Amino acid sequence: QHLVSCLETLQKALKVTSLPAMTDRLESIARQNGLGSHLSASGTECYITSDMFYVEVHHGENPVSCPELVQQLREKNFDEFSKHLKGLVNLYNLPGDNKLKTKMYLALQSLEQDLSKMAIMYWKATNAGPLDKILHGSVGYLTPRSGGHLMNLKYYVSPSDLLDDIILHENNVSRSLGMNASVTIEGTSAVYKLPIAPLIMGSHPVDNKWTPSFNSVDLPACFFLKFPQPIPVSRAFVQKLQNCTGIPLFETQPTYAPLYELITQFELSKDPDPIPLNHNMRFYAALPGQQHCYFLNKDAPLPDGRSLQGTLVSKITFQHPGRVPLILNLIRHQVAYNTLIGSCVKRTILKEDSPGLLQFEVCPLSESRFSVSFQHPVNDSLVCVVMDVQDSTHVSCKLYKGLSDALICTDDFIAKVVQRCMSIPVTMRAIRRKAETI
Amino acid sequence: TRERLLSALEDLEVLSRELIEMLAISRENQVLELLIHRDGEFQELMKLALNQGKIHHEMQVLEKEVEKRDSDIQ
Amino acid sequence: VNLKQAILQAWKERWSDYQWAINMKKFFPKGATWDILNLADALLEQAMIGPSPNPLILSYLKYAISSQMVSYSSVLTAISKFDDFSRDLCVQALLDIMDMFCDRLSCHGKAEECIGLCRAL
Amino acid sequence: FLPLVHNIIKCMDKDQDLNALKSKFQEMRKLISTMPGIHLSPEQQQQQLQSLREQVRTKNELLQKYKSLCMFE
Structure with missing residues (x-):
């Protein structure tokens, strides 16, 4: 009986005819997502579950006539409307009970208002362009929740990916054109105290001031900062991040292997192909001038004697937004280091390459530092460029050479070329070219 | 083509x-x-089915014209 | 041709230490005990350039000490010529390399090698 | 055809026998839609048109040739 009901949504989804049958297609969408449909007149039909009730013509007014939803329905995109309902259902997958669910949603609304105000304060203090806000701003470019989609804070926009095939952001910044993190309430086994009303009642003109808790209630949930693709993070970052918040980042200690392997998986899996690369940590890179091979050297001992080890993090839980500015600054840092080392990872088949193969390599000297070692471009001794990722957007590099050697490069010229475009497989090219030009 | 359309119709109905x-x-x-x-x-x-019929009516007119011309010539 | 070109012809294509030993033999017909050619000097230069040493060329030097390719005297001189001292990681690597041969500190050769070991100590 | 089939499915979801009989009559109408003057493909339709055009042109040309042919000075 229930399978025949699910059976009819499927054949009603392939049904496509006039407006009457398109209203029956909206009824199909309801039972497809296991929703309940009540229709008053031909014009208004309402899908109702919990507080997730919306009408195409609980505890809150109908918020907005979203152009997004209206445009999709007016045009022939019932599939897009189906995705939007799925997003709404996932947001309210909240367990809780009833009165607790309404309060828990209220807490999310307070957090959203506070985060929005904090973003506004940064714009008032400095009229920064969207790119500056995303790369180095309090919170991040923030899009308020629309329908199912929850608030997205853009932590970082990599220089290579800002450029597509020299994009100027404008206020039209795409939702996925960068690295994005979503803020949401999710149920937890433990019990926590969360603000149930806006906590930025009084705001100090520079930065923000939060009125102290209790209002608040001990709901069995915490605010979350879910990342759409899990970000590989190192053990040292877990300690640096914990120092501020205090909430255990990984709680039940799971697995923790070399970080460089996880960085390769994240980069390789961005574009999926059937054949596994089988890199053996010897990625080959082809560039406009010269050919390079990079050995990532995981398992090199750090000063402690343990190889850099880290575990993918998808959800970070924060009670209030006070520790959020500090947590984001550490993340920004972990993400930037991953991007520079990530730019090298590539799925190429450089086999039997006699010319060039100007191989470069990478050893983990310490958490937050790595050394790329290469033969001197003009002379013969091994030379290297470190890149400690001090901050998300800032890397400091020192090119030590032997006592008798040819001045390979000026640290500033390399920086100018990298900031113009970017990528670190790219940084090694600039070091080689500058040395050769001299 | 007619056969294919008829087969599709029967399959769909059943x-x-x-x-x-x-x-x-x-x-x-x-x-x-x-x-x-x-x-x-x-x-x-x-x-195609709709246009085919219009084309067929046009073809019938053309045929009538040709027939007349021939009979006249003969 | 040069030892610097071989040591990274060894670092480039990832060579394990014994394959480095074989190919280092093949690149140079006269062994010259490897200390006339200053193996320890070239390995320390192209290992201690970065803030942290690359573990490949340190693995090459630790094999070239543990296997008796390189005398302890040339290693102790090449350790002595490093200083810089602003980097603790390179200094800790040098002290682990000294922790390898120290105490044994044994020369089985000519007496000039023993005098060289004395000056190197 | 497909709309009528979907309407029959909607009637089944609501439930009738009369509607199924109507679907059978629609299938008879479909057999009529297979042959209300249907008999040819898109290619054949193109060849027949070209042949008819060529025939009209040739007949008109022959008639004009004898139109000019004036037997009386």
Whole structure:
């Protein structure tokens, strides 16, 4: 009986005819997502579950006539409307009970208002362009929740990916054109105290001031900062991040292997192909001038004697937004280091390459530092460029050479070329070219 | 082509009837996929079916004209 | 041709230490005990350039000490010529390398090698 | 055709026998839609048109040739 009901949504989804049958297609969408449909007149039909009730013509007014939803329905995109309902259902997958669910949603609304105000304060203090806000701003470019989609804070926009095939952001910044993190309430086994009303009642003109808790209630949930693709993070970052918040980042200690392997998986899996690369940590890179091979050297001992080890993090839980500015600054840092080392990872088949193969390599000297070692471009001794990722957007590099050697490069010229475009497989090219030009 | 259209029509009717009857007995993605595939076949050759008839009427007119011309020539 | 070109012809294509030993033999017919050619000097230069040493060329030097390719005297001189001292990681690597041979500190050769070991100590 | 089939499925979801009989009559109408003057493909339709055009042109040309042919000075 229930399978025949699910059976009819499927054949009603392939049904496509006039407006009457398109209203029956909206009824199909309801039972497809296991929703309940009540229709008053031909014009208004309402899908109702919990507080997730919306009408195409609980505890809150109908918020907005979203152009997004209206445009999709007016045009022939019932599939897009189906995705939007799925997003709404996932947001309210909240367990809780009833009165607790309404309060828990209220807490999310307070957090959203506070985060929005904090973003506004940064714009008032400095009229920064969207790119500056995303790369180095309090919170991040923030899009308020629309329908199912929850608030997205853009932590970082990599220089290579800002450029597509020299994009100027404008206020039209795409939702996925960068690295994005979503803020949401999710149920937890433990019990926590969360603000149930806006906590930025009084705001100090520079930065923000939060009125102290209790209002608040001990709901069995915490605010979350879910990342759409899990970000590989190192053990040292877990300690640096914990120092501020205090909430255990990984709680039940799971697995923790070399970080460089996880960085390769994240980069390789961005574009999926059937054949596994089988890199053996010897990625080959082809560039406009010269050919390079990079050995990532995981398992090199750090000063402690343990190889850099880290575990993918998808959800970070924060009670209030006070520790959020500090947590984001550490993340920004972990993400930037991953991007520079990530730019090298590539799925190429450089086999039997006699010319060039100007191989470069990478050893983990310490958490937050790595050394790329290469033969001197003009002379013969091994030379290297470190890149400690001090901050998300800032890397400091020192090119030590032997006592008798040819001045390979000026640290500033390399920086100018990298900031113009970017990528670190790219940084090694600039070091080689500058040395050769001299 | 006529044969293909007739076969598609028969398949569609039987399978749609079977799916509806199973829904009725309870209170079928294989059937659904088959339906949409032959529905595309019928619809794409239904624009053709309409025009074909108009073209056939035009052809009949042309034939009449040719016949007259020949008979006149003879 | 040069030892610097071989040591990274060894670092480039990832060579394990014994394959480095074989190919280092093959690149140079006269062994010259490897200390006339200053193996320890070239390995320390192209290992201690970065803030942290690359573990490949340190693995090459630790094999070239543990296997008796390189005398302890040339290693102790090449350790002595490093200083810089702003980097603790390179200094800790040098102290682990000294922790390898120290105490044994044994020369089985000519007496000039023993005098060289004395000056190197 | 497909709309009528979907309407029959909707009637089954609501439930009738009369509607199924109507679907059978629609299938008879479909057999009529297979042959209300249907008999040819898109290619054949193109060849027949070209042949008819060529025939009209040749007949008109022959008639004009004898139109000019004036037997009386």
